[PDB]
């Protein structure tokens, strides 16, 4: 039963600050990133696509370009961590992570900006 979990389902962030939101997925110690797919989206806008062990920035939505990045050092630990720098008011909303690593699941995280 592949399950994605979230340490927090809501983040309150200050304007101009940096934000890192996380989704956790099961790792079996012999991690193969060629089988892992990580997808982050906010209101139908593509943020991250980590496929075939590579971040495909060719599909990144305009606002999230050069501000959004997946922390690849955390993937081996079973953590899909999306870092968004210089947070704007338009970054407030519902985010979703869709992870596939054998099975597949998804979780929603809300972000509020002050």
């Amino acid at each position: 039963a592949f399950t994605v979990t979230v340490p927090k389902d809501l983040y309150v962030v200050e304007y101009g600050s940096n934000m890192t939101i996380e989704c956790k997925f099961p790792v079996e110690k012999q991690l193969d990133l060629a089988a892992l797919i990580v997808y982050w989206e906010m209101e139908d806008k593509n943020i991250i696509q980590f496929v075939h062990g590579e971040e495909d920035l060719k599909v990144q939505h305009s606002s999230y370009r050069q501000r959004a990045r997946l922390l690849k050092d955390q993937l081996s630990l079973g953590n899909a961590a999306l870092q968004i720098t210089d947070v704007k008011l338009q970054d407030a909303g519902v985010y979703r992570c869709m992870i596939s690593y054998g099975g597949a699941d998804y979780k929603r995280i809300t972000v509020k900006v002050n």
Partner: antibody
Amino acid sequence: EVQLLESGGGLVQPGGSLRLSCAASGFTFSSYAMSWVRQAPGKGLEWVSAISGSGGSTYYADSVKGRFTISRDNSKNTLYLQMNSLRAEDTAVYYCAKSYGAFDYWGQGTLVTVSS
Amino acid sequence: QSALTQPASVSGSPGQSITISCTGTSSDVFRPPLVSWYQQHPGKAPKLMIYFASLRPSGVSNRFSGSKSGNTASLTISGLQAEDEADYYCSSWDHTGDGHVFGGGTKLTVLG
């Protein structure tokens, strides 16, 4: 290049048994979950069974539970479907499919005909 | 009886958009952020067109796009060509995250 070659199909009498095999190549077989998806002549796709990369976890559609067994050999890169107690309703083309977010690669299928 | 529901057929003139809808019968079978779409030509095996509701695999034409809204997933084909005539199937991961379900398929007709 990724290749999935199914074999083992043919005519089986009702209540009989058959084993299908799928030889995979062009990818690290043990890193991906694999599935068997079938399609009755002229009808739609039906998911049959899935197995994890290591072979430690197997999943079945309710229509084939207790009759079909999925297995894999991660040294010969081969996927199997052992079918027992076959029924006329199991007549279909059986596809071997690689799971990677979705079925990104499919074999060309093997026809299984259950008839007296 | 397929767990997912799509139209039996869709018809349309060439050089035009066309959308096929996918929907479920419960939450345990249909999860829109994990919807895949497949194209199947006569006598051929299915081909992955869209995965994760809107993601396009390498090799798939930019004329094929997918979207989701509420408890619905859609496949849109822009600039219809004659070669697009095929059966299209939607699929979703089940509630467990291990099994799968398929829609009953949609036969696409290019009317020109």
